[PDB]
Structures are given as structure tokens and as C-alpha cells.
Amino acid sequence: FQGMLEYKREDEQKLVKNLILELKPRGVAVNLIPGLPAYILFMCVRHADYLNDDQKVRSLLTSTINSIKKVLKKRGDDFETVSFWLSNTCRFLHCLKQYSGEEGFMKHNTSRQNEHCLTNFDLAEYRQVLSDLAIQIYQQLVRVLENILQPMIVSGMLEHETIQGVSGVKTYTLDSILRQLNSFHSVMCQHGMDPELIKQVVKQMFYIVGAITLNNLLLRKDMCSWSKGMQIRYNVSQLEEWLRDKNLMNSGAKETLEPLIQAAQLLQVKKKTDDDAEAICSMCNALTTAQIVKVLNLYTPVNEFEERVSVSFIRTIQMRLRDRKDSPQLLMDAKHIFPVTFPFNPSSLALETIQIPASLGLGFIARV
């Protein structure tokens, strides 16, 4: 077996119906081998290349791309569906690179894998189409994950009171958020998403959690107190622990929380003297002037003995930050998406070992 798959051109629409349009992300076969639909489609591309059949390669690629776009339009509100197709679009792109026969993409190949390179067609124009599509599919995933998290954020990060996580004497909780992040991470891993892509997804969703949290704090009257600063610092420390548990500290995710971290620190720091003001100006390098001024204006005294922050103290901070080219924006842009990349991730999977389970309904294709 050479690691190719043959099909009759008459069956191309049934191929993509069964492998893409109607394929269930929870099926046993594709969970035993993550990326299986991408490997099978690539093995089909190999045989059309072997035949030197331009029109068959063109038809298969168009049918494949159109079918992935159709699934994501119809069911693209579903996290598992979007994760699954993002993962498989990426793996299909990696296969087209790894088996292109271009020297730069072959550095991690076995001898046998090099024997599986395409021999008749340069598919660089389709690789570029797939890369461009992957950017948009990732944006779709980010918005689906945001919509799921959004109702939990303020309740769990701000409204739910704890004492270092424990109910105090004195709806969604911090634990709700962490369990939901757990679910997102589990599903991406089950789908074989690239580790470098999972890192980006996690950085983006930490950015969203921090930005929704800080904007909500800036827009209400009751979240700027010593007590709430303590709570926010605890909650962020558990988000950092989640990263450590997942071995994701190098994702950049913790750094995206710096504006919320600094706002919470402003709730704790001394707020009286000119040295206190200088310290705030050096500390708050991830908050705009308007954000610093808002938190200090909102700050609630810890008891009846404490005065509100004085207006002259706030003015001192405003005056000493004038040199900033500071954006007068009060709110973080919670819709920002960090530009995503898909670094080449070759696979050790040996194509000649791939079996086609009966459960996919692909009996009409043949191993070559």
C-alpha cells in the first residue's frame, strides 16, 4: 500500500458529503485518529496527482473547500464543529506543505514520507487559499468561544464574592469560568488542534476575560474598593494557576490580563502623597490615563474614617501623564483579535498505515 486513495469522479459529491458535510465530530474513528478527514482528503489528492489529472485535482479541492465552508455556515455557531474543522483545515494545509516536495517543508520527514510527496502538481495557490480561510475560521471560533463565556465573566470575576475562593459569611462563579475553559481546552486537544494554535486561542480568550472584566468595572459604581481588588487579584491568580496546570504559561495569556491586574493593584495602593502618585504613574503602564482616573474617582473608602481620593491627587496624576500620547479611550477594545498564525506542523503519521473505518461510509473509495 502506497498511502493513496482512489475514487470515481462520479462519486466526488458522495465523498465530500460523507467525509465533510455529514461527518460528526464525535465519531469514534476521527477521535481515535485526530485529523483523519484531512489525511483522507490528502490521500485522495495524492492519487489525483499520480494520475496527472488537473481537472480531478481542481474538482476535489473546490469540492473540499466548498464543503468545509458549507458546514461552518450551517453549524458554525457550534464550538465543537468549528474547532473540528479549523483543526482539519490546518492539518490539510500542513499535509499539502509536508508532502509538497519542496525542500524547506521536508526537514522533519522520514525517508518514507518523502516518497509520498506530490510529483505532478504544485498546489501553492490552494495552500494560500487554505491559509487565508484558516484566518477567518479562527476568527469565527474566537467569536463562538466569546459568546459562550460572555454571560459568565462579570458574575464569576466580579459579582461572586469569595475569601480566597471560599464562601464567606458576609449564578456563575469563578469555577464556572474555569470549568468552561477546561471544556474548550479538552475539545481542542481531542480534535488534534496544533499546540501553537491552542496557545493562541487561550491567549485570546484570556484577553477577552480581562477586557470584559475591566470594562464592566469601569462602567459601574460599586466594584472599586479594597475588597474587590483583593477578590480580583485572587481570581487572576487562579487563572494563572490554570495556565500552569495546562503547561500554557508561555502562551502569552497571563500578560493579556495586565490592565485588569494593574486596575486591581490601584485599588490597593496608597493614594495620598506625591510619592504615591509617582508610584501609580510608574505602575500603571498598561492603563490609559482615563482608566486610571476613572478607578481613582470610583474608589470607595474602606470605612467611614477614610476620605475619597482627593480631586487634587487625581489632577496630579492627570498632569504627570500629559506626556503620554495617551488614547482618551475609557474602555478596552474587547473585540480585538491578535493576528493569528499557523506555523508549519509536520506530522509523524505514516500515510500507508491509515485505514478507512466502515463507520465513515466510504466503501466506494479504494486503497492504493
Binding site: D54, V57, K69, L118, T119, F121, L123, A124, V129
Partner: peptide
């Protein structure tokens, strides 16, 4: 490594294929 044929897309075909939302 053989010389391979680059499969060329037209610009309208490329635009349609690479637009996620056209479907």
C-alpha cells in the same frame, strides 16, 4: 524533485474560494 505544474486559479475563483462567508 521534478518540475511540477502550478495549478493556477483565476482571480474571481480565488476570491470566491478564499472567502469563508461565500457559500
Amino acid at each position: 524533485q521534478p518540475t511540477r505544474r502550478q495549478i493556477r486559479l483565476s482571480s474571481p475563483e480565488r476570491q470566491r474560494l478564499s472567502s469563508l462567508n461565500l457559500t
